[PDB]
Ligand binder design. Structure first.
Ligand code: BCL
Ligand code: U10
Ligand code: PC1
Ligand code: PC1
Ligand code: PC1
Ligand code: PC1
Ligand code: SPO
Ligand code: SPO
Ligand code: SPO
Ligand code: SPO
Ligand code: SPO
Ligand code: SPO
Ligand code: SPO
Ligand code: FE2
Lengths: 44, 281, 51, 52, 258, 307, 54, 48, 43, 55, 44, 55, 55, 54
């Protein structure tokens, strides 16, 4: 309840769930891209 | 950590990026979005210079030299040990400089003052980008840039200067040197005049701007004025940098022979190229 | 799209300078003759903005 | 008023500004590359100013 | 003394270069202390002296004997704001912005701030008022450039809010300082010449909107302006750049708008 | 795209300002010259009056004879040909005597003897002018900051032409009087002394010459930024700190952590420029007399990779 | 160690997280560039020599 | 990690998202250029 | 003692969330270091 | 060495902790770089020779 | 009781006690880190 | 010498401690860097020669 | 001799002590660097030659 | 000779003492440095030759 930005706790939870969903979607696509390159050219 | 008058000017707003996300002060410094970029690029640039000293094998600060990639690599990437670090530092230096100028812009808007200072600083950056970016790109090799060393970036100046004979004969250089000498002359005169008018002979009253104009009118018969001298200071510095940026961007790109050879065009003017006597013929 | 008299005066002087410089560089035997004549006319034109 | 679009719009807004700045910088670098290629640099070019 | 070394590689050139580092270190110390005659000692964000004052100690005070019998000024000295600052702390931790409690342009805070200078007109070397209207100025006239007198005054909202009536001139420097803009209510405000852009047919004031022109602080005497009135006028107009951004119709203002 | 105060957008032309009269002998002061509109866009339009006293006359007479002597040698080198004179104007030179003559005044008039005469006139001209700066400040009761700021310039000027040649025991080490010659003298100076870049004092002078450009660009822009608050009147800001002085203080305090005052910034200004020539004089003085090769000196002092 | 929560009684979380975010990313970039510089641990170079990419 | 949402009561959300977009794009640019720098992993060259 | 205005409980909640983030960050680092050490040890 | 707590009556806790944080990091970075410079104690070079990564 | 920072003696004692605990923790990690290095590669 | 405490009636403790802190660190750094420069007393290189690290 | 205490009526005790502290340190640093520069009196090197640290 | 005390009515004691102190030290540095420069009177090398340090 610090209220530095003025957002209520509920809005923070809703925004974080939106942000995390995009983060995992972004993470998933990056993993696929890394798999594609490692198949094409492994770096280990 | 605040001056006796600083409080009433510390208000939100004026930020270009981030709003109040980075709108805070660390001690006297104002952070802003671009100050975070400033600190990161500054810290990263400094560390890679220190790390480049490790790879070079020396710790003497004057011997530390971050050489740019050799001419064989052209304008591509290079190994970090043999030019690649310089490219990262140059990117970090470019990021730090432009972020610093843009951070000054935020401070300008917060205080409501003109943007002369960041515009003045941008002239220095374009002067910097001339040497490390614009000139090497035209010449097609990062090796034409200068190393990030205290006494090795002087070797670059001496070597590049003597590539074209005596570099003094560069006409854009002569203009810029006259400006640099004039600006320092103006600064000494301007600094000394105000101090003379503000710290006069003991017991005598602090002088007025009229005494400043009276002194220089009694001296050289003309006073440019308090507004004029600060306009003169700004323009003398920027012109010096503008012609210094110009002098290098034409060297090795438009002119390739000795600069003394350039001056023969005046001697070879049609109406006196063949008259006997004098220095030339 | 709101150029002042001085802004337009400078723009024409640049056009005059380039134009007259080429004119007298062809007419004269050297590019400097064009530079002098083109520069003087452009400086005279740009130093007299009607107002 | 969609929260998923609003967050994505902000991140796309930042990525666009970074993209324009980076693309603008490449434009200047490309411009000087073109001018240097046009000028007779390769025909006569200076030696290395600093030890490789 | 070519190659004459006292010890090791240390020679006359080495003697001079180190002796200069000592001199330059001493000189930088001296220069920095002189800069500490204003705004010091430091204060907390409330107004009490801070626990930190800096590595450089305060200098011995020096006295400036002001011209025209205005008195003396000894610095460093006890300096006070001498005005209520209408700002509110936005965070208990220091190094955070203070938000205005009310209207910042009227409260003289932020970019619209001003200092309690001496409430007297500034004098030339002869004791006369340095800044006077051109009408009361003896022989002064517009010598070059577009004469702004009579031109409509357009604010940042692209709306005309009056016309120029008179020009105030710094008599020693012989350059214009203020434009005396008459509003629709019959009163005339002062606009700094640095904040206006006299175009071909109008005086464009990017700082203030048409409705804000009436809010400019007024002068007590039509024939002279004191230092305090200059700060209030200059502060108010320059404060308009950030505090009238919502009212500005410029494209860049919209991009930088919140 | 607003008014940046770089050029005045309006000019006002009142009566000419005759200046203060603290202790200045008005008889030696001349009248007011013309008003230049071209100069009025940037600064003040009024030219003159100029004071001309005893040291003013000595400065002009020696200054004219110095200028005249170079000109006559320039005509002699041209064969009295006006076309040749304009063609080889920059390539003309009043060279100092040959190294064989050393410091002796036995050099032939056309082989260095004339340069000694011209150099004497410049010597008297400059020193008489320095006293003129001193006495003009004393007459108005101001500080002697200009006199000692000037003496910094004289120190480098004395070193290049007078002091260093004496130590080297040869007038040939001095500076020729010419546009391109004294450029060539500069280049030949470094090459003989082994890459003058590695002169520590030459590097310092460049630091302060760069810094003077840095400080004046910083200072000039700062005052123009706060000129909207009447910040250009710096003397009143020193007397009575207005909002321009505070904002100028705060901009640099929030930018680089520390700031200055309206009066203390000009102490940085004078010392930044004075050290340009002050360190310059020592840097040239050591060259040849103490160090015959700076790069070898740099190697033995850990400034070059070798040794 | 249980009293370390009082560091936030002294340091504002907004400035610390900005300071910490810069510090960690600066530190992370620092280490990766150190490894890349050395011929060993340059994983891009290691695979090239291991798989004959030259 | 069940209270990481509270960081949005510390930092304003829209400001962070813009800054994060800048950070992600520049980081993506950073890595791609390093790959192009190496003689291998340079897709623009090995194809030709 | 008060500098940031946080109460004792607010600091305890703030620290616990911060420590949770620290250990999560540390855990990935330990996993990463094991992966690199297995792939190529530096001791 | 019992009344060392009074240093906080002289020194502001906020400024010292920032100064100490900067000091410790730069001191730690300095010592690591000193070790890396020397051919011995450069653990990056040590492991390469120990496990023959040169080939 | 100079009180330049405004802290009371009780506040200083509590701040110092936490500060020393952080210092001894930092020192303890360092001592272990030095033992690990000295065992792996002694410098004496 | 019991009146040496009076130095704090003349010297501000805040400025002295910062100056003393910087002086002690720079003095400590300077002596370490002098020792690391000499072929002897460079404890890094001594161990390398003692334990045959350079091979 | 006895009346030397009056120098503090003229000289500011704070100015002298700071100047004296800087003077003594710089003088001490200078003399130590002189001794280190000479092949003799360089106690680091002479001890190295005494016990044959480097051979 | 007995009225030399009057000179303190003309000269400020503080500036004279500071000027004298700087001059005496700088003069002392100069002479001690000059003696070190010459092979003779270089007492560091004099002892080295006497006791065969090298
Ligand atoms: C190949 C050439 C050499 C070199 C050789 C020298 C030499 C030689 C000298 C300098 C000197 C200078 N060099 Mg260097 N220099 C080189 C490269 C550089 C570079 C560079 C980026 O490469 C830079 C920035 C500089 C910069 C500088 C300046 C800092 C410095 C001169 C200060 C000054 O104002 O002098 C000009 C000002 C004066 C001489 C003072 C004049 C004062 C008198 C009183 C004026 C009288 C006026 C007279 C009467 C005329 C009146 C006319 C009427 C008014 C109309 N050099 C290379 C390495 N340089 C000087 C110096 O001090 O070095 C330590 C110097 O002597
Ligand atoms: C309100 O606007 C106003 C300004 O202020 C914002 C101004 O500054 C000015 C003042 C400006 C001038 C009076 C002159 C400006 C004109 C120029 C910039 C001249 C252009 C110069 C060139 C074309 C350069 C080339 C010229 C050369 C090299 C020829 C000369 C050669 C020899 C003689 C040899 C005015 C009038 C003004 O109205
Ligand atoms: C080499 C040349 C580099 C030139 C960089 C110029 C950057 C100028 C940034 C201008 C931002 C203007 C704007 O509205 O941006 C909106 C957004 C930020 O919007 P915001 O949400 O911070 O709000 C801005 C408006 N205020 C603060 C008043 C509420 O800009 C960005 O996306 C960030 C800039 C990206 C920087 C790229 C660096 C590479
Ligand atoms: C004469 C011209 C000399 C030019 C060469 C030196 C220029 C830099 C001078 C730096 C300086 O004085 O900074 C002091 C300042 C000190 O400022 P500060 O940030 O410690 O706070 C101001 C200190 N008090 C309160 C005592 C005034 O240094 C810095 O802030 C960092 C500069 C890094 C270099
Ligand atoms: C910034 C400096 C700008 C101005 C430089 C003027 C000349 C300075 C050098 C000089 O005179 O040196 C010889 C003199 C005397 O030489 P010396 O031989 O007595 O001491 C040097 C010691 N060895 C030989 C081991 C190198 O050097 C000094 O007095 C020391 C000055 C050191 C300045 C180092 C600045 C380091 C900046 C950080 C690193 C950044 C790297 C990128
Ligand atoms: C390797 C790089 C190390 C950089 C940091 C060096 C810090 C040296 C020790 C400073 C110290 O003990 O005092 C902390 C102090 C804490 O005190 P402070 O920050 O409150 O200083 C306030 C100023 N006084 C007290 C003098 C009025 O930090 C500093 O002042 C920073 C000094 C840095 C000097 C850099 C050169
Ligand atoms: C030295 O450099 C090299 C290259 C050598 C090595 C580099 C090392 C370092 C230091 C790397 C640094 C890595 C870091 C710090 C990575 C951080 C990554 C993170 C945390 C990324 C976070 C991403 C989050 C995103 C993209 C969130 C997005 C959320 C939304 C868009 C909102 C949700 C909405 C959705 C999904 C709908 C979108 C709408 C449409 C129409 C598709
Ligand atoms: C020379 O260079 C080399 C590399 C060779 C050697 C260098 C060595 C050095 C100097 C190494 C330095 C190491 C150090 C000191 C590393 C530091 C590590 C630490 C301390 C990392 C901390 C990580 C913490 C993280 C990532 C915390 C994350 C927290 C969150 C995501 C949650 C934040 C949200 C909160 C608290 C919301 C709370 C709000 C309310 C209202 C309760
Ligand atoms: C080139 O020359 C070389 C380097 C080779 C040789 C070097 C030569 C030279 C020039 C050497 C010079 C050495 C010097 C001058 C050494 C001096 C050392 C001193 C005086 C050190 C002092 C140390 C004192 C310390 C660490 C004191 C610490 C104090 C505390 C931890 C307690 C602080 C807290 C207090 C006082 C609480 C305040 C109390 C109340 C009631 C409010
Ligand atoms: C070039 O020379 C080389 C590098 C070769 C040799 C190096 C030589 C030198 C000069 C070495 C210098 C070493 C030094 C000076 C080391 C000093 C280290 C110290 C003193 C470190 C201090 C550590 C303290 C720590 C980590 C404390 C942490 C504390 C916390 C995390 C808790 C903070 C929370 C508090 C205090 C709560 C506040 C309480 C209330 C009631 C609000
Ligand atoms: C080219 O150079 C070489 C080296 C070759 C040859 C050098 C030649 C030259 C130019 C040599 C020049 C030598 C000179 C000018 C030497 C001058 C020496 C003098 C005059 C020294 C005087 C020393 C006096 C001292 C140290 C006096 C000290 C006094 C006190 C400590 C007591 C002061 C306290 C007072 C007055 C208390 C205040 C009293 C009251 C009532 C308030
Ligand atoms: C048609 O034109 C007429 C003839 C009407 C007039 C024109 C004149 C012209 C074209 C003049 C041109 C002048 C020029 C090109 C001057 C250039 C001067 C330059 C570039 C000078 C640069 C450096 C000069 C220095 C550093 C000179 C220093 C001189 C001294 C320090 C004085 C040394 C004093 C000495 C040797 C005294 C010796 C004598 C005795 C009796 C002991
Ligand atoms: C006895 O020790 C063992 C068991 C390890 C024996 C093993 C021996 C062998 C043969 C080991 C094999 C290899 C080697 C040489 C391993 C070496 C490992 C090392 C040197 C590990 C070091 C780890 C250090 C860590 C994890 C340090 C963490 C410290 C921090 C993150 C700093 C946190 C402090 C902060 C943030 C202070 C901030 C406070 C304020 C007031 C701003
Ligand atoms: Fe000024």
């Amino acid at each position: 309840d610090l209220g530095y930005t003025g957002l209520t706790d509920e809005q923070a939870q809703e925004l974080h769930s939106v942000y995390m969903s995009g983060l995992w979607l972004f993470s998933a696509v990056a993993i696929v891209a890394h798999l594609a390159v490692y198949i094409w050219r492994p770096w280990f | 950590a605040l001056l006796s008058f600083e409080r009433k000017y510390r208000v939100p707003g004026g930020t270009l990026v981030g709003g109040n996300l980075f709108d805070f002060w660390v001690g006297p410094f104002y952070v802003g979005f671009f100050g975070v970029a400033t600190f990161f690029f500054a810290a990263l640039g400094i560390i890679l210079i220190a790390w480049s000293a490790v790879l070079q094998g020396t710790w003497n600060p004057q011997l530390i030299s971050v050489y740019p990639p050799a001419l064989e690599y052209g304008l591509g990437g290079a190994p970090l040990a043999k030019g690649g670090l310089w490219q990262i530092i140059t990117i970090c230096a470019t990021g730090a400089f432009v972020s610093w100028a843009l951070r000054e812009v935020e401070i300008c808007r917060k205080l409501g003052i003109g943007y002369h200072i960041p515009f003045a600083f941008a002239f220095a950056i374009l002067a910097y980008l001339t040497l490390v970016l614009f000139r090497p790109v035209m010449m097609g090799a990062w090796g034409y840039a200068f190393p990030y060393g205290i006494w090795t970036h002087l070797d670059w100046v001496s070597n590049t200067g003597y590539t074209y004979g005596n570099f003094h004969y560069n006409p854009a250089h002569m203009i810029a040197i006259s400006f640099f000498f004039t600006n320092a002359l103006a600064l000494a005169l301007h600094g000394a005049l105000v101090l003379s008018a503000a710290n006069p002979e003991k017991g005598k009253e602090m002088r007025t701007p009229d005494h400043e104009d009276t002194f220089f009118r009694d001296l050289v018969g003309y006073s440019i004025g308090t507004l004029g001298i600060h306009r003169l200071g700004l323009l003398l510095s920027l012109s010096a940098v503008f012609f210094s940026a110009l002098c290098m961007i034409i060297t090795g790109t438009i002119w390739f022979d000795q600069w003394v050879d350039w001056w023969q065009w005046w001697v070879k003017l049609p109406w006196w190229a063949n008259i006997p006597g004098g220095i030339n013929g | 799209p709101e150029v002042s008299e001085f802004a337009f005066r400078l723009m024409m002087a640049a056009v005059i300078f380039v134009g007259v410089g080429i004119m007298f560089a062809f007419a004269g035997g050297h590019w400097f003759v064009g530079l002098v004549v083109g520069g003087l006319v452009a400086a005279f034109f740009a130093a007299t903005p009607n107002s | 008023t969609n929260l998923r679009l609003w967050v994505a719009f902000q991140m796309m807004k930042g990525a666009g500004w970074a993209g324009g700045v980076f693309f603008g910088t490449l434009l200047l670098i490309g411009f000087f590359r073109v001018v240097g290629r046009m000028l007779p640099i390769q025909e006569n070019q200076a030696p290395a100013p600093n030890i490789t | 003394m070519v190659g004459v070394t006292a010890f090791g590689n240390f020679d006359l050139a080495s003697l001079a270069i180190y002796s200069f580092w000592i001199f330059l270190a001493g000189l930088i110390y001296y220069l920095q202390t002189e800069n500490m005659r204003e705004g010091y000692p430091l204060e907390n964000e409330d107004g009490t002296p801070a626990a930190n004052q800096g590595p450089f100690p305060l200098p011995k005070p020096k006295t400036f004997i002001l011209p025209h019998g205005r008195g003396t000024l000894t610095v460093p000295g006890p300096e006070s704001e001498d005005r209520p600052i209408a700002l509110a702390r936005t965070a208990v931790s220091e190094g955070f912005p203070h938000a205005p409690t009310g209207d910042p342009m009227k409260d003289g805070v932020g970019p619209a701030s001003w200092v309690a200078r001496r409430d007297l007109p500034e004098l030339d070397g002869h004791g006369h008022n340095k800044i006077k209207p051109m009408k009361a100025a003896a022989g002064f006239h517009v010598s070059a450039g577009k004469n702004p007198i009579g031109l409509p005054v357009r604010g940042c909202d692209l709306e005309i809010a009056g016309k120029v009536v008179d020009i105030w001139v710094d008599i020693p420097e012989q350059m214009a300082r203020f434009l005396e803009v008459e509003l629709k209510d019959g009163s005339t405000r002062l606009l700094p010449m640095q904040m206006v852009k006299v175009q071909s047919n109008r005086v464009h004031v990017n700082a203030l909107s048409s409705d804000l022109f009436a809010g400019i602080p007024t002068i007590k005497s039509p024939t002279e302006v004191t230092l305090l009135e200059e700060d209030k006028i200059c502060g108010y107009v320059a404060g308009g750049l950030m505090y009238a951004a919502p009212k500005r119709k410029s494209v860049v203002a919209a991009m930088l708008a919140e | 795209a607003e008014y940046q105060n770089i050029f005045s957008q309006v000019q006002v032309r009142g009566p000419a300002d005759l200046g203060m009269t603290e202790d200045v002998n008005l008889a030696n002061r001349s009248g007011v010259g013309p008003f230049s509109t071209l100069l009025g866009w940037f600064g003040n339009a009024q030219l003159g009056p100029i004071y001309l006293g005893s040291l003013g006359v000595l400065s002009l007479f020696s200054g004219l004879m110095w200028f005249f002597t170079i000109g006559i040698w320039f005509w002699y080198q041209a064969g009295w040909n006006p076309a040749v004179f304009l063609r080889d104007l920059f390539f003309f030179s009043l060279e100092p005597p040959a190294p064989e003559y050393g410091l002796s005044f036995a050099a032939p008039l056309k082989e260095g003897g004339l340069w000694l005469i011209a150099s004497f006139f410049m010597f008297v001209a400059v020193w008489s002018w320095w006293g003129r700066t001193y006495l003009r400040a004393q007459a108005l009761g101001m500080g002697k900051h200009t006199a000692w700021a000037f003496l910094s310039a004289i120190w480098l000027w004395m070193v290049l032409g007078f002091i260093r040649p004496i130590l080297m025991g040869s007038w040939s080490e001095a500076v020729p009087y010419g546009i391109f010659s004294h450029l060539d003298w500069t280049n030949n100076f470094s090459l003989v002394h082994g890459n003058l870049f590695y002169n520590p004092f030459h590097g310092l002078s460049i630091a302060f010459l760069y810094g003077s450009a840095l400080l004046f660009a910083m200072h000039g822009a700062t005052i123009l930024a706060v000129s909207r608050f009447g910040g250009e009147r710096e003397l009143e800001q020193i007397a009575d700190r207005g909002t321009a002085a505070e904002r100028a203080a705060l901009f640099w305090r929030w930018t680089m952590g520390f700031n200055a005052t309206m009066e203390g910034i000009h102490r940085w200004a004078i010392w930044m420029a004075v050290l340009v020539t002050l360190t310059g004089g020592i840097g040239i003085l050591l060259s040849g007399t103490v160090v015959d090769n700076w790069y070898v000196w740099g190697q033995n002092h850990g400034m070059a990779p070798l040794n | 160690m249980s009293k370390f929560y009082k560091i936030w009684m002294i340091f504002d979380p907004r400035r610390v997280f900005v300071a910490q975010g810069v510090f960690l990313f600066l530190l992370a970039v620092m280490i990766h560039l150190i490894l890349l510089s050395t011929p060993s641990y340059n994983w891009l170079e290691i695979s090239a020599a291991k798989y004959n990419r030259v």
